[PDB]
Design a protein around this ligand. Structure first.
Ligand SMILES: O[C@H](c1cc(C(F)(F)F)nc2c(C(F)(F)F)cccc12)[C@@H]1CCCCN1
Ligand SMILES: [Mg+2]
Ligand SMILES: [Mg+2]
Ligand SMILES: [Mg+2]
Ligand SMILES: [Mg+2]
Ligand SMILES: [Mg+2]
Ligand SMILES: [Mg+2]
Ligand SMILES: [Mg+2]
Ligand SMILES: [Mg+2]
Ligand SMILES: [Mg+2]
Ligand SMILES: [Mg+2]
Ligand SMILES: [Mg+2]
Ligand SMILES: [Mg+2]
Ligand SMILES: [Mg+2]
Ligand SMILES: [Mg+2]
Ligand SMILES: [Mg+2]
Ligand SMILES: [Mg+2]
Ligand SMILES: [Mg+2]
Ligand SMILES: [Mg+2]
Ligand SMILES: [Mg+2]
Ligand SMILES: [Mg+2]
Ligand SMILES: [Mg+2]
Ligand SMILES: [Zn+2]
Ligand SMILES: [Zn+2]
Lengths: 102, 100, 25, 81, 96, 201, 91, 127
RNA sequence: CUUGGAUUUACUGAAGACUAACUACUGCGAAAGCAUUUACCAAGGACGUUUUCAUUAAUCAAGAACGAAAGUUAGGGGAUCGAAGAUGAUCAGAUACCGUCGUAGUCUUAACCAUAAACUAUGCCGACUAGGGAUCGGUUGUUGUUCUUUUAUUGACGCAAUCGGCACCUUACGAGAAAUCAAAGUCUUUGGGUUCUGGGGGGAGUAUGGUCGCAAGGCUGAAACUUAAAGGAAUUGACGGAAG
């Protein structure tokens, strides 16, 4: 639980609400930083990967550490075939025709 | 030509000395070159040491001093007249001036 | 002129010379 | 000083000189006979010894090496040869 | 310091390198000390220390891995555990 | 407008029995209302009062004690020891040139599980018959003094509770014992335990 | 002999994609094809599976790592912060 | 018999703060600055404005009941100047002359171990 | 930026840097450089030596290591300062000085770059020539001094020698154009060994070629033409929005 982690704790797969089984900081290389606690109101302040500060119930849970597989974006894809294979198992959103060319 | 045998600093048997900032203008000056003055002044001027001693709740209370070490670059010191231009022969004298 | 700024001027003129020869290779 | 007897220096100033700067260089070290209190056995030990020498009779360290002359342990008396 | 003591024991005394040799020496009672590297699997560790408990043999836990224990023993290979059979010029059994 | 000082209630601060003048002073807080109690906003407060005031004597003028309140009994605040520090002017008057300064620190637990950091400071003393201008100690001597300092604070803290340690601090027992223990290493002056910090309560 | 002066592993890409992109591929692709030390058995038998998956051929231990290296700096920092906190003042 | 507060006087070279709190310092009793008593920026830090501000602080504190204070003089500190501004001495003398009683006086100027870079650049601020 | 509670005040926490005072005509390192504690790893000078080897040495084209800051590529970090930029003043104009923000950068990890008034503007090794007091390291002899502990084998301090250093003060036998110099002396009474560089000022560290570098650039590097001086140190005066 978020209240059981001291300030500055790097945590991952954090619950927005008690029991949704993980919502925040689930992508590769990402995490949530625990900024501080407010025990009187039973709330915890965290910093999300986007840089936003959020107030979550202190009963919400998270997993200690950084999500594995980080640094993936550092390498160029270099190829249309590489982007094709990337989205072949994600969804039909590639390639994109520019609207000005329609 | 060469003006000072010490090159205006105090670096001998040394390569580099870490710098300090002038108190007045914040100029980076090498620590050996800076004009340094140690001042230990009373926090209250002698005019007010009386009314403050009468207003003191302690009988025979010593006023604490203010300890400070001031660092000046050559420009800061010359402008503030901490040091002055001396004659060619008077430059060599390294005893502290006899004033205090 | 100041020697340092004259040097910068000469560096800029070498740059121009190099680009001009590179134009026709 | 233009005239001075270089071949016969005064022995007082000659003894203050560094060991390599005399007319003929000569070591200032010597050997001593050290008597431990426990027994009586002559053991020759170098004055500027670098080893913790122990006598054969009793396994007692006679001297401990220092930067210069070795320091004799307590109860050990030395006599210069 | 323990590296110097271990180098002296390997140079002058007797030892066995390897799990099978250590277990044989514990069965035969010929072991004076068993040294186990830090990255040894825990199941093997708790088995070596059950053998050492039965044999009444001290255990030293090396802080480095089997690569550092191997290079400490002057070997060009990895040593996961070792037993000291005869401390010679060293005093490791008297110090550990 | 409203003069928020009409709603302030004065409370008394009580020091441990280790000091003499237990009437530390007065504090104030918003009066307890239905929505907000005076107690919760008044407990947890830290008061910094000079040890010369806590002891009457002027020999302690350069040390000042932090007292942390953690229980309230009516109009009285029951404080506990929170820390020690030297005054800035005293330290600046002790740090001269042409002498060696030696410092040490240690993280230590009390008998009652009070986590402290204790900072010790000392300076080389110039002998009365000394002629040379400077009085410098070799870095090896400074390391040996620092080690003796470290093991003395460790012994004199791990063997006692926080109240007893405070009773040791008031007559400067630790500084004099460090000075006595380091006589055979190098002459020292102004040997003080200049700061103690509570980390966790 | 030495076969390529500077392209190295990116010599499979020929003249395409731009030199900056090819040297950017080379930096991370040497890391993803390197052999790493196993923290469990000590052998140099750790190789990447898919991204984030690092297997040891010898002891058959799989560890979660970075996309192209076994450990990222953020993970190294968390490992060291946790080891301190514990094996220290807090026991 | 007296009730001590803590008079935290911050005298920089651009302004002068006379801030009277309680003994703990978590409760502020009176805070009048030298910039609140004059309409010129060039003399917001004047000794006259600091003394008048301190006298008004003493008058407001007295009607609340604080009868004695400890003095904590400070300068700007940090990477900036370590000498107190000209108004802190006048505000202190005015406080002493206003019937308020003075206890211990200490300097609490923030002095860094080493520092964190100082503004002005390598060549300093020219003019 | 501020009645949306700024600034200030106390407690708590988080980030990165950085190591004040102590800090010096003091230390170490080949230089660049190096300043919180402790542990670990491997180095180093000097000193002491009646230990060991015996010319193994000195300086060095080619060839190498390191090399402040800035700068380049990619991650990390990115508090403070802050090129560029934005902004408020001043001004005839200021895209300058001054004020408030601010991106690269400042920090770190993998690689590059190889330049500084990188200065002691003084190559390295060796010998000799003059007095003095300080100081750091080591060694060797010794106190009307304080101290361990109550004393010794405590340590500190004091007095002498010595070797090595960082330097300093006086004189000028001597050198120099002089400023000045214990080396910049032992140079027309010219020769201890050796490496590098210069031949009036510009053109010009330019053009070209080569080579290294991702780039910025680095190293090597002319000629045509032009010119009677450029320059060094000191003297007298004049002037200063420098001091008395
Ligand atoms: O509160 C801080 C803190 C930081 C960090 C980290 F850097 F990883 F984000 N992790 C902390 C953790 C964590 F569990 F490792 F996450 C616990 C407590 C404090 C932490 C400081 C700094 C580390 C040592 C003491 N805690
Ligand atoms: Mg499609
Ligand atoms: Mg697209
Ligand atoms: Mg169309
Ligand atoms: Mg000039
Ligand atoms: Mg040196
Ligand atoms: Mg330099
Ligand atoms: Mg000016
Ligand atoms: Mg410090
Ligand atoms: Mg030193
Ligand atoms: Mg060469
Ligand atoms: Mg970057
Ligand atoms: Mg930034
Ligand atoms: Mg800024
Ligand atoms: Mg403008
Ligand atoms: Mg500006
Ligand atoms: Mg050059
Ligand atoms: Mg220089
Ligand atoms: Mg040069
Ligand atoms: Mg000496
Ligand atoms: Mg010419
Ligand atoms: Mg001239
Ligand atoms: Zn493995
Ligand atoms: Zn300047």
């Amino acid at each position: 639980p978020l209240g059981a982690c001291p300030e500055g704790t790097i945590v991952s797969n954090v619950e927005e609400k008690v029991g949704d089984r993980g919502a925040l900081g689930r992508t590769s290389g990402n995490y949530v930083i625990i900024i501080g606690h407010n025990p009187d109101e039973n709330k915890t302040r965290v910093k999300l990967p986007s840089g936003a500060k959020k107030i979550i119930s202190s009963d919400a849970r998270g997993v200690i550490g950084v999500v594995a597989g980080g640094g993936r974006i550092d390498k160029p894809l270099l190829k249309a075939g590489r982007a094709f294979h990337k989205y072949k198992v994600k969804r039909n959103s590639w390639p994109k025709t520019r609207g000005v060319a329609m | 030509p060469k003006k000072r045998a010490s090159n205006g600093r105090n670096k001998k048997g040394r390569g580099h000395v870490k710098p300090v900032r002038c108190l007045n203008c914040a100029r980076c000056v090498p620590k050996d070159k800076a004009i340094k003055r140690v001042t230990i002044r009373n926090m209250v001027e002698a005019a007010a040491v009386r009314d403050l001693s009468e207003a003191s709740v302690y009988a025979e209370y010593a006023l604490p001093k203010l300890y400070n070490k001031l660092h000046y670059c050559v420009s800061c010191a010359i402008h503030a007249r901490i040091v002055r231009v001396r004659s060619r022969t008077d430059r060599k004298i390294r005893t502290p001036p006899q004033r205090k | 002129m100041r020697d340092k700024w004259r040097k910068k001027r000469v560096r800029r003129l070498k740059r121009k010379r190099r680009k001009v020869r590179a134009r026709s290779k | 000083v233009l005239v001075q007897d270089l071949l016969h220096p005064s022995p007082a100033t000659e003894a203050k000189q560094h060991k390599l700067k005399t007319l003929v260089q000569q070591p200032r070290s010597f050997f001593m006979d050290v008597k431990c209190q426990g027994c009586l056995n002559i053991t020759t030990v170098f004055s500027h010894a670098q080893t913790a020498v122990t006598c054969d009779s009793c396994s007692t360290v006679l001297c401990t090496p220092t930067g210069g002359k070795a320091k004799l342990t307590e109860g050990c008396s030395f006599r210069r040869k | 310091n323990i590296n110097s003591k271990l180098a002296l024991t390997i140079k002058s005394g007797k030892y066995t390198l390897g799990y099978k040799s250590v277990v044989k020496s514990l069965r035969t009672g010929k072991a004076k000390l068993v040294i186990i590297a830090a990255n040894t699997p825990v199941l093997r560790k708790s088995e070596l220390e059950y053998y050492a408990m039965l044999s009444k043999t001290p255990v030293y836990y090396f802080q480095g891995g089997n690569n550092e224990l191997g290079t400490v023993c002057g070997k060009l290979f990895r040593v996961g555990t070792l037993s000291i059979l005869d401390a010679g010029d060293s005093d490791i059994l008297s110090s550990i | 407008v409203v003069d928020p000082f009409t709603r302030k209630d004065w409370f008394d601060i009580k020091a441990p029995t280790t000091f003499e003048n237990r009437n530390v002073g007065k504090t104030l807080i918003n009066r307890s209302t239905g929505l907000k109690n005076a107690a919760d906003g008044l407990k947890g407060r830290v008061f910094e009062v000079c040890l010369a005031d806590l002891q009457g004597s002027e020999d302690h003028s350069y040390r000042k004690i932090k007292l942390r309140v953690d229980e309230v009994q009516g109009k009285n605040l029951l404080t506990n020891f929170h820390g020690l520090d030297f005054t800035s002017d005293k330290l600046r008057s002790l740090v001269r040139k042409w002498q060696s300064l030696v410092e040490a620190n240690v993280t230590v637990k009390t008998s009652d599980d009070y986590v402290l950091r204790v900072f010790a400071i000392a300076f080389t003393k110039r002998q009365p018959n000394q002629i040379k201008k400077t009085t410098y100690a070799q870095s090896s001597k400074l390391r040996e003094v620092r080690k003796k300092m470290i093991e003395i604070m460790q012994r004199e803290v791990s063997n006692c509770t926080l109240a007893q340690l405070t009773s040791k601090l008031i007559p400067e027992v630790i500084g004099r014992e460090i000075e006595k223990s380091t006589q055979t290493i190098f002459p020292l002056q102004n040997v003080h335990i200049r700061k103690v910090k509570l980390l966790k309560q | 002999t030495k076969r390529t002066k500077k392209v190295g592993i990116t010599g499979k890409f020929g003249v395409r994609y731009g030199s900056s992109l090819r040297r950017q591929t080379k930096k991370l692709e040497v890391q993803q094809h390197a052999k790493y030390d196993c923290s469990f058995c000590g052998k140099r038998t750790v190789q990447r599976g898919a991204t984030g998956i690092w297997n040891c051929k010898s002891c058959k231990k799989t560890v979660a790592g970075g996309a192209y290296t076994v450990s990222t700096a953020a993970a190294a920092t968390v490992r060291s912060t946790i080891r301190r906190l514990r094996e220290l003042a807090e026991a | 018999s007296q009730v001590f507060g803590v008079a935290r006087i911050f005298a920089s070279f651009n302004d002068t703060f006379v801030h009277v709190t309680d003994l703990s310092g978590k409760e502020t009793i009176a805070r009048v600055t030298g910039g609140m008593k004059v309409k010129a920026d060039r003399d917001e830090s004047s000794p006259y404005a600091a003394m008048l501000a301190a006298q008004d602080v003493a008058a407001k504190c007295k009607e609340v009941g604080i009868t004695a204070v400890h003095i904590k003089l400070r300068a700007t500190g940090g990477t900036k100047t370590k000498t107190p501004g000209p108004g802190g001495q006048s505000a202190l003398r005015a406080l002493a002359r206003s019937g308020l009683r003075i206890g211990r006086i200490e300097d609490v100027t923030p002095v860094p171990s080493d520092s964190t870079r100082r503004k002005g650049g390598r060549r300093g601020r020219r003019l």
